[PDB]
Design a protein around this nucleic acid. Structure first.
Ligand SMILES: [Zn+2]
Ligand SMILES: [Zn+2]
Ligand SMILES: [Zn+2]
Ligand SMILES: [Zn+2]
Ligand SMILES: [Zn+2]
Length: 139
DNA sequence: ACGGTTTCCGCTAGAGGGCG
DNA sequence: TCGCCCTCTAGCGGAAACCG
């Protein structure tokens, strides 16, 4: 409506939007950096990748003047540093509270995901394949 | 106190959406 | 239209902070 994707269920109004989405399915990265071996699927992510080469920090916190490469990083810094009563991330499986969303993801794969490279309990010889079960068992 | 682990914090880079 | 630019999202890795 008008342009449905055919593999996944994406659809959007513009032909360029559906073709860019299909580049996400195929893996085509048309726009090559003229400086290194990076290549992007659209023009914007290449322009933004060029800031790493130039080393520019075009965003500045209007409160403490720290500088940042991207706006989202600046916004988040303002949120964690110059703002109170902000919602935190409580893990569903344990009692852990984390300030940032992706750190919660890091926590979930690192403490609550299966690893066949299991660890032995420090005090007995039983082995566990998820760290939280291990540390809880180690009572 | 001391090493390991957990959380912080700026970083790169991945998607989709609005509009002139 | 579609090229431009925007936010939101996902993870990385060094540093700091926390703990048994
Ligand atoms: Zn698709
Ligand atoms: Zn490059
Ligand atoms: Zn600031
Ligand atoms: Zn947890
Ligand atoms: Zn045991």
């Amino acid at each position: 409506k008008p342009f449905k994707c055919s593999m996944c269920d994406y659809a959007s109004v513009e032909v360029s939007k559906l073709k860019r989405h299909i580049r996400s399915h195929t893996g085509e990265r048309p726009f090559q950096c003229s400086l290194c071996s990076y290549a992007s699927r659209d023009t914007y992510k290449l322009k933004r990748h060029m800031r790493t080469h130039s080393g520019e920090k075009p965003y500045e916190c209007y409160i403490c003047h720290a500088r940042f490469t991207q706006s989202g990083t600046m916004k988040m810094h303002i949120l964690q540093k110059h703002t109170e009563n902000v919602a935190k991330f409580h893990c569903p499986h344990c009692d852990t509270v984390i300030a940032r969303k992706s750190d919660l993801g890091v926590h979930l794969r690192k403490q609550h995901s299966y690893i066949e490279q299991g660890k032995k309990c420090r005090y007995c010889d039983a082995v566990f394949h998820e760290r939280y079960a291990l540390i809880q068992h180690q009572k």
